[PDB]
Amino acid sequence: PLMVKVLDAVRGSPAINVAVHVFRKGLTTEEEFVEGIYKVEIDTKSYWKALGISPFHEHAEVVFTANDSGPRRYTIAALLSPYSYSTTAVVT
Amino acid sequence: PLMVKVLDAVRGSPAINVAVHVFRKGLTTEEEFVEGIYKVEIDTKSYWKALGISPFHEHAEVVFTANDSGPRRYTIAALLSPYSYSTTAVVT
Amino acid sequence: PLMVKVLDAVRGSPAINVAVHVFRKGLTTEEEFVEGIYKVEIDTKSYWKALGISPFHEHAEVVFTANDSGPRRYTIAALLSPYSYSTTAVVT
Amino acid sequence: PLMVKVLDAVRGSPAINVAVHVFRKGLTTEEEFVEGIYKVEIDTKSYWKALGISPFHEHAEVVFTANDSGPRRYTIAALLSPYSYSTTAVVT
Amino acid sequence: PLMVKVLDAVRGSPAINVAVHVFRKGLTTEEEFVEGIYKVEIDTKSYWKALGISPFHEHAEVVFTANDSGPRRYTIAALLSPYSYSTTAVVT
Amino acid sequence: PLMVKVLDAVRGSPAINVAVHVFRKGLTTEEEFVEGIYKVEIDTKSYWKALGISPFHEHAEVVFTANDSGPRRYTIAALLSPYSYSTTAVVT
Amino acid sequence: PLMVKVLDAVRGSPAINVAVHVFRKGLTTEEEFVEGIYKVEIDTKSYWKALGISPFHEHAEVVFTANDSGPRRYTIAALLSPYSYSTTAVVT
């Protein structure tokens, strides 16, 4: 008897992000997994990944140049931050 | 008997993002998984990925130049942040 | 008898991020795992990862240059910080 | 009889981040694990990781140059810091 | 009979980060573990990790130069520091 | 009968970070462990780690130069320091 | 009968970081352990660690130069120092 009870009763106006996971049981491999339930990615950069089997195997002169240089701006007042009866403001 | 009960009773006007996962049981491979349930990606950059088997296998001179340089701006007052009885404002 | 009870009763307007995991039981491999339940990544950079089997195996002169140099700005008043009856403001 | 009770009763408007894990039981391998429940990563940099089997195996002259030099700024008033009845402000 | 009771009753508006783990039982390997429950990483840098089996095995002259030199600034008034009935302010 | 009771009753608005772990029972290997429950890492640098089996095995002249020299500044008024009815301010 | 009772009753608004661990029972190996419950690491540097089996095994002239020399500044008014009814201020 696996019984899970979450926020059974609520009297009011809450701000919530419920996440309930009940479980009863190739160069890259992933199996039987839960990812990105609430994963906020901002300005995420992946250049060379999982290129493959025998990549640049022989006489492969490579010139990798990664330049992350820009007037970039990110302004998030509330990230994964539920708020009740409040005042949120990005004043810019 | 697997019983899961979430937010059974609510008295009011809540702001919520419910996520309930009940489970009872090639160069890149993924199996039996839950991804991107609430994954917010902003300015995500992937250049060279899973190129393939035997990519640039022989005498492959490569000149990779990744330049992320721009007047880019991102303004999100509330990201995955449910809010009740509140004031949200991006004043710009 | 596995009984789990979370925030059973609430009288008011709380700000919450509930995470409940009840469980009753290739170069890179991951199995039976929970990732990114609430993982906020900001300005995350991954250059060369999981290149592959026999990458640059023979006579492979490589010139890797990673330059992270930019007028980049990130302003998050509340990250994974639920707030009730409060005042949040990014004044810039 | 495994009974877990968290924040059973609440009288008011709290700010909380509940995390409850009840459990009753390749070059890189991970199994049966919970990661990133609340992992905030900011300006995280990974250059060369899990390159592969036999990478740069023979006569591989490599010139790795990682330069992290930029006018980068990160301003987070509240990180994983739930707050009730308070005043949070990033004044810049 | 394994009974765990946390913050059973609350009368007011607290600021809390509850973490409850009840448990009743390849070059790099990790198994049966809980990581990143609340791990805040800021300006974390990993250069060469888990390169692989037989990396730079023979005649591999390598020139690794890691330069972390930038006008970088990080300002977090409250990190993993829940606060109730208070005033938090990053004035800059 | 393993009974654990934490902060059973609270009358007011405390600021707390509860951590309760009840447990009843490859070059690098870790098993059955709990890490990063509240691990705040700031400016953490790892250069060469877990390179692999037979790394630089023969005639491998290596020039490792790690230079951590930058106008870097980190200002955190409250780190893992919950505060109630107080005034926190990073004035800079 | 293993009974553990912590902060059972609280009358007021305390600032606390509770940590309760009740337990009833490869070149590098760790097993059955709890690490980083509240480990704050600041400016932590690890250069060459767990290189691997047979690293630089034969004729490996190595030039390791680690230079930690920068105008780096770290200012944390309250680290793992919960405070109630007080005034914390980083004035700089």
Domain range annotation of chain C: 1-92
Q: Which two tokens stand for residue G51?
A: 């290189």
Cβ pair C51, D55 in contact under 8 A: yes
- What determination technique applies here? cryo-EM
Question: Within a 10 A sphere around the Cβ of F37, how many other Cβ atoms?
Answer: 26
Cα–Cα dist A59/D59, whole Å: 10
Q: HSE (CB half, 13 Å, CA atoms) of A31?
A: 9
Phi-psi region of B43 (alpha: psi -120 to 50; beta: other; left: phi over 0): left
Residues 6+ apart with CB under 8 A from A44: B41, B43, B44, B45, C41, C44, C45
Would you call D2 and C5 a contact, using CB atoms and an 8 Å cutoff? no
d(CA C34, CA C69): 34
CB C25 within 8 A of CB D26: no
Consult the annotation and say whether G86 binds a ligand: yes
Residues 6+ apart with CB under 8 A from G62: F56, F61, F62, F64, G56
Nearest to D31 by CA among B69, A11, A33: A33
> Are E88 and F88 within 8 A, CB to CB?
yes
Q: Which residues of B48-87 are buried (b: 16+ CB within 10 A; e: fewer)?
A: bebbeeebbbeebeeeeebebeeeeeebbbbbbbbbbbbe
CATH superfamily of B1-92: Transthyretin/hydroxyisourate hydrolase domain (2.60.40.180)
Alpha-carbon span C85 to C14, nearest angstrom: 9
C-beta atoms of D18 and C10 within 8 A: no
Q: Helix, strand or coil for residue G25?
A: coil
Chains with at least 3 CB pairs less than 8 angstroms from chain E: C, D, F, G
Q: Is G71 exposed, middle or buried (0-12, 13-18, 19+ CB in 10 A)?
A: exposed
| Binding residue numbers of D | 5, 86
Q: E77 and F90 in contact (C-beta within 8 Å)? A: yes
Q: Is the dihedral of CA C57, E59, C66, E74 positive or negative?
A: positive
For residue G59, how many other CB atoms are within 10 A of its CB? 11
Which residue from B77, B17, E19, B39 is spatially nearest to A16, judged by alpha carbons?
B17
- Three-state DSSP class for B49? strand
Q: How many CA atoms lie within 13 A of B77 on its CB side?
A: 19
The closest alpha carbon to A81, from C76, C11, C19, F81, belongs to: C76
Residue D77 CA: distances (Å) to CA of D19, E92, F52: 22, 11, 41
Place of tokens 């009814």: G85
Interface of C with E (CB under 8 A): 12, 14, 27, 29, 39, 68-69, 81, 84-85
Bridge partners of C64? A64, D64
DSSP state letters, C16-28: E--EEEEEE---E
Q: Choose the closest CB to D20 out of C6, C65, C77.
A: C6
